[PDB]
């Protein structure tokens, strides 16, 4: 079936294949479908819109199930290659308003303000995932109906005993680099069969545009290998760690001289908003964040510099030179990056 | 056996391989066989006619079973590549008349009229299919003697849990783009293991040819993988949807200013012919069309703009701008594109 | 999943993938993780440092688990190709001191002296490994719950009966040559499924780098083949021989006329320090070194010219010409090249 | 192994093996082991007291892990047969006070009250369970990673595709009838692989004993079949009915003419105690009792004559004849029969 | 094969097969063969002697490999049944002196001392063993290259996933009860696949004999199941409890009223002999006895009333009533019962 999937269409025609991708009803799964266009295009403004049956996804009533999707971001296709592209789309109503599942409209509204634009907000998102076997929700390298050895050799270890699913991870890393996602590294986590990828400094809404892209690519890659991928914080319970997502924030004021006071003020503003942020960081965070294995408490807001378990973590270089980034470690691995980045920018700058 | 199937003959010889393809006795299955020609040919007029045994297919008596096949359409071969071609042929009688299974003669006669030629009728065909396991007529991704999970995630799903047979679909999409079929996109449908492909705006009789070509190509790609493909309107019964085929009609007068009145008149003329069209859209359509959750019914004719369950569906933008096209949703997935295109053209224009 | 792992990124971007590699808590296992850099880099001085969680490895307390890793050596990447690199790193403390597991600091301190720099010392390290089946601890090619034939045909055997896991060995040899490790040959040892590779003459701390590189590569290669690799001296007990590592030492004075007296003086200095060297060559080397068939013994120090069962072995051409190297055969196969090379250089030259 | 498990020791010796069974720390798991006795015995008061280690079960601290075992009931041994017996036992501290997980002490105190003794109380317990595959915890007859057909054919089914695990049910029914349990019927429930059994009319505390023996037998029989039994109320989520256990209750005053008034008064007495009863009758019952199909809800208490959603139901025959029992449908499959029976007796007979 | 193994020879002939069992060179393994005898016999002194090849076992030099076999105890054959018997034997040199591996001679001399004979010593033995898979030496019910769940559910478990290999335990229990062994209980230990059995109160040397016979039966039963028995103290390293045996000891003076003073004097006498006792009670016991969970240590001798970590424990009953036995928890599962019983008798009754 190869020699047909990997067939170069630029030798015989100029038509391109576009991949319209949107978010399903639950707010965590991705839906996509392809089309053909007369020629190459790289500006999202001049791409046609679509519609789809919202009843089949859970985002529209029965009588008028037409749901409109608008192209928003363009990346290079790492599966079809050539001149084909992936389109990260946003979903509206035929009247013209976003559906309640749509969250990029609010994010674009927040990031479009002159203040946030002048602040040059930069976000870096670290995301876990767990590779499970297909039919039984049992992670890779775990024997069927059997636990693996105790933790300790699975964190960045090399060998057939410790690295489970490294082919998928290397393929995902090269595919995300090829497509255009600003990926900044990979590593293996303490749980066996659990890995991590980081989307590096990316400005504004573009951040949320590409991390959502990476997930899509990752899932599709696993579809080739017959493996399930879970971003759920707690796929396995017991003495095994959870999966979470970390956010690195860097405004222009922080990177300049005297930015430590800016960081302190931003963290103080983030404080007293702990409950709303926790309630908007994604379902399942209750089980992941309980204090085990140096994890931040759900009901307490404390920030440190050297402690691994804290709400907000500030590095040594930032404490020394008084400038840099700061890291929030509360968001769960099944979050919505649009929401998290939006309200972080809201609390830091817009809020008074 | 590779390195021999994928062997380039253009480095050693000028001879080409042609694939004569025709429709079998049942009117739904395809038959084909290959031959060798001295050099490249691109015009269907200068291709030699061929013959076959009608008794082995079910289209001729015992005494004189020879059936003549006339080359009609030429496409590029996506399996042999090089300068080889696929020939979409038509079946006649040695005396000179079409056999009762032949339907392209009537369509060509209708489309050859000056009125239909001057009106630039364009058709678009949406075709459903289902991927079943080989020995047991049981769809892909369904456990043997076991139903899959409830519907809802399989419509455009991405993970390994949702997309079944995606490699065949991508191969078919690229192969049809390579050959020359004006394919316009693909997607996955609500039933697991069920997919869709659109043949885009194509003018006149060529439309029909293209559709059949695509089907042939799919029928071959599946047999590389070891999967059965069914266009039957209802392969699996219960709370599972059925495969279907949609048609999009657009004449020149509809495409111009004041075309909404033309669309209304055409739909009015299509009405009162409901029973004949229903009886001429494909066996098994009774089991698919049942009024399930506001969908088309066999015994009732309805048309609307947002109610997608009507017999005739007209888009919102087409109504508000007047110009555009319209869509008929009654034809079954085992139809004959010649017949439906001919009937639509005759009712809209030729009929008084 | 190929066509994505083996995807050339130099055709679309300038960014490189770097592989930071360090030594885990036990002093014998290797941990690694990757990142992306804006462009190509070849000097280790101008590479950024990292940090990692020492708690997950066993090299830091609970409260402040951050362990800093400094790039030290650069090699080409034999798995990613292109402009990607492997970085052999060294572990420190955020205060600035090496952790007790760090051994390259001492080695660099010893090799940075003017005396050792002026007197060029070259080291060659022979390393033996065993290939075992994955889930069981049973060596490759042995039957499950059964022993192979008696020894004698497995030393450099050619047929399918004697060469077990040769594909891994050939791949490792080619990959180590490609990356830049100064490899100098391979062979198969007397035990079936056991092999050996030589890292050739390389000067100073560089040796301790590239050996640790080769091991990493080897282990990663086994991940592709689903095989476990063991450098443990005695993976199998009975009448089956053990795995060891040998060190060829040659300073500048030994390479010149009258160097036999230098070799004799160096061996005299190395003697009477048997206990410390043995205790620093590994823990549990008594199992491999017993004295069977006149081999080396732990409690006794001996040196000869042809007695293979001696602590120090001197080749025939060396006393024939009075110049050359000498071979120490005490270190175990799970040694630390930093420590061994440091002790040999310190005893030979620095000590009085 | 067999012909030794089925070995008649009465031909050779007069000693008898006694099997002691107690309830573990979780309050719903059963532990048991074996003892050798000089001769046959039928009186539980003639059986010696005994002990076990509470640390290994979760019932005592490390300093005092000794937990004493008091024989309370005797049945026949169905697996060893002959003169060997099963003993149902109670758990006590070395000092003489029952441990917190002990619940038969309070029930025996309640059932020894002169009013309860003279009222001749009769219970019948309807207990449902689910059979699961050993490794993957997927119900019996369910394809791995799939679902069976919709509900409706499995209730009291007879075919090979409708009754899944009737061998285990037949073996358990015969074994409980041979041991001495009053088991009064079995059938297959609506879900595949789910069954129930009825422990018939047993007076007072004895009822709670028999059920705690019946469960034991079931478990061991599943151990012979390599299947896992589950008394969890809702093992599978979706449109699949759960497993809840009910209790029919009657008293001598209810067996007399005009007892419908007494049944009514007991019904109001059991009412307005819904909170404590639901709290003490099993956790995890919220998933089972939701309100679907007009059934019982946790937050609402309902009693009627024909409504199948009633928390407490009274049959037509009770109204007609004027006397009988009434059925409590509140508890789940994972109850403790002791607390249920004792609470019903308290809230009906003695508590004012 | 069967229906011939279970063949009754009493219907046809009067000859009886006698099975001779002895202890091999390693001091732990058992060897055995079969002999044909003219008729039934029940007295060990009426049985002929054997001789066997000590070279093939590891007990005699090549020039004199003849080792004489002395019958000592007689039990019934559980595998051949009928009138066939098992014989426990003693090993001797041709001249007449015992071989070094013989240990029953010294215990027989000790137990024939008039004071020991008059004291009528009573012993009980607690033997714990582990069942392993045949080829890979991984415990029963453990996934290959994996681990089961944490400890806690397996102690005296009943389910299919908690008790592993209970068929072997049942067969062994009934076979030992039919043979004539005083076996007084079985249960499942905390580790999966690990069990124990208690050899009950047997007077003097006879105790040890029975234990050996018991071991023999166990091994042969495992041979039927294709499983490997292991009496090694610590087969699996990690957070898994080992297999250590125990010995309860009583004397007529201890059973007499006011015997707690005698028990205390015996405990004091057994104290300060810890070095010799630990040396002679099994090697490889260092791994089992470390000090975890406040247990016994090799370098610490402790005796108490309730501390479960005591080397010699005394129950509450022997303090309340003042009469009873005491339990030595020092020896491992691979003891020789002869030497343990003999030294316990010596250091209490005759040694001053």
Residue numbers in the entry:
A (entry chain F), B (entry chain G), C (entry chain H), D (entry chain D), E (entry chain C): 4 to 355
Published text:
One such an example is glutamine synthetases (GSs) (EC 6.3.1.2), one of the most ancient functioning enzymes in existence and a central enzyme in nitrogen metabolism of all living organisms, catalyzing the formation of glutamine by condensation of glutamate with ammonia using ATP as an energy source. Decades of studies have established a striking notion that all three classes of GS enzymes, despite of dramatic differences in amino acid sequences and protein sizes, share quaternary geometry in dihedral symmetry assembled with two oligomeric rings. Considering that the active sites of GS are located at the clefts formed between two neighboring protomers within the same ring and distal to the ring-ring interface, each isolated GS subcomplex ring holds multiple integral catalytic sites. Cryo-EM structure determination of GS in both the catalytically active and inactive assembly states allows us to reveal an unanticipated self-assembly-induced disorder-order transition paradigm, in which the remote interactions between two subcomplex entities significantly rigidify the otherwise structurally fluctuating active sites, thereby regulating activity.
MALS analysis shows the GSII from Glycine max being largely a homogeneous decamer in solution. When supplied with ammonium chloride, the stable decamer-adopting GmGSβ2 demonstrated significant GS activities. To elucidate the detailed mechanism of how the interactions between two GSII pentameric rings remotely trigger enzymatic activity, we next employed single-particle cryo-EM imaging technique and first determined the structures of GmGSβ2 decamer, as well as that of the CsGSIb that adopts decameric configuration (thereafter named as CsGSIbDec). 3D classifications of 104,717 and 43,876 particles for GmGSβ2 and CsGSIbDec, respectively, revealed that both molecules were arranged in D5 symmetry with two pentameric rings stacked in a head-to-head manner, a strikingly conserved structural feature for type II GS species. Refinement of the GmGSβ2 and CsGSIbDec structures yielded maps with an average resolution of 2.9 Å and 3.3 Å, respectively, with literally identical dimensions of 115 Å x 115 Å x 95 Å. The active sites of GmGSβ2, CsGSIbDec are structurally highly similar to each other, as well as to that of the maize GSII, suggesting the catalysis mechanisms of these plant GSIIs are essentially identical. The overall buried inter-ring surfaces for both GmGSβ2 and CsGSIbDec amount to ~2000 Å2, that is approximately only 400 Å2 per individual monomer–monomer interaction. This highlights the weakness of the inter-ring contacts, characteristic of type II GS.
